[PDB]
Amino acid sequence: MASEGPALYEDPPDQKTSPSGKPATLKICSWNVDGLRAWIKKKGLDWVKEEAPDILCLQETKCSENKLPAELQELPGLSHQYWSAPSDKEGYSGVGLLSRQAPLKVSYGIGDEEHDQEGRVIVAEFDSFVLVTAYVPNAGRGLVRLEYRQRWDEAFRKFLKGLASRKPLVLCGDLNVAHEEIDLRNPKGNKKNAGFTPQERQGFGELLQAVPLADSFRHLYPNTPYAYTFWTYMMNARSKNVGWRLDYFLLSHSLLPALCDSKIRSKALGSDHCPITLYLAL
Numbered sequence: 001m002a003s004e005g006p007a008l009y010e011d012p013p014d015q016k017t018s019p020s021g022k023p024a025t026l027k028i029c030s031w032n033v034d035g036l037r038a039w040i041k042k043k044g045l046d047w048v049k050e051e052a053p054d055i056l057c058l059q060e061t062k063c064s065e066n067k068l069p070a071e072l073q074e075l076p077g078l079s080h081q082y083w084s085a086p087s088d089k090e091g092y093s094g095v096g097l098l099s100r101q102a103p104l105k106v107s108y109g110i111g112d113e114e115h116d117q118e119g120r121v122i123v124a125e126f127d128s129f130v131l132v133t134a135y136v137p138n139a140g141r142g143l144v145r146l147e148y149r150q151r152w153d154e155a156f157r158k159f160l161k162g163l164a165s166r167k168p169l170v171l172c173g174d175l176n177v178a179h180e181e182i183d184l185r186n187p188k189g190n191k192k193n194a195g196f197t198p199q200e201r202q203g204f205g206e207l208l209q210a211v212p213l214a215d216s217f218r219h220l221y222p223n224t225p226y227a228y229t230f231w232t233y234m235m236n237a238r239s240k241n242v243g244w245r246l247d248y249f250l251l252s253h254s255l256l257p258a259l260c261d262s263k264i265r266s267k268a269l270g271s272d273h274c275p276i277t278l279y280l281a282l
């Protein structure tokens, strides 16, 4: 990180109407919170209250479903709350989905035992679309988990293609890959690191192709550099904007006409990731 100084990024203003002029009717916020308790202490809920999304998706809660912070009972506009944590009941990984309205159905996991033990996926079916939030397994230090990650990628893509065959799909969360060079500050130095291996990048391309899905942010901002969602807490990385875009909203092609905007909330503190926000005119 000795070669990088600051690179400026200012997320554009919120575009809240679609290309057809329809006002957004759905606001979804996604956030890897780096520990639910830690994030709450760091005032994450105060930020959520200001953002006022219709649906909030959280990853890396690191929190047993039996040990939820009581502060989550102070979110009256997000009163339907669903959680999945590792089946061993330990405090790591973990996702949550909090919604203004109750979904038609909530499910956990991807229908594959091997991949359903670490609290990584919630599926929330609504009238006109299905929402999936995910915390994708990291490839690990020394890439020791890369083989598992490739198995996960395949199982997950097949699962999502199935869902999308029935209803339009929105996938959000920490997908643990920077797809292209534009998606991280230092592509050259990270090609052998978790999050930017050729294996992971191509797995992401495979996901877009197979389902298929569009990367909402990149669709809208195809040439925009320095837009990241994660910065290591070390090396003063966030202040220099030496980051990675690891957090996405991926959409069925049929939802593109409903796409108003896909935001990166760069200034929102409380984790080593920042929130992302999607506006749809459904």
Ligand SMILES: [Mg+2]
Residues within 6 Å of the ligand: 034, 035, 060, 272
């Ligand atoms: Mg973390």
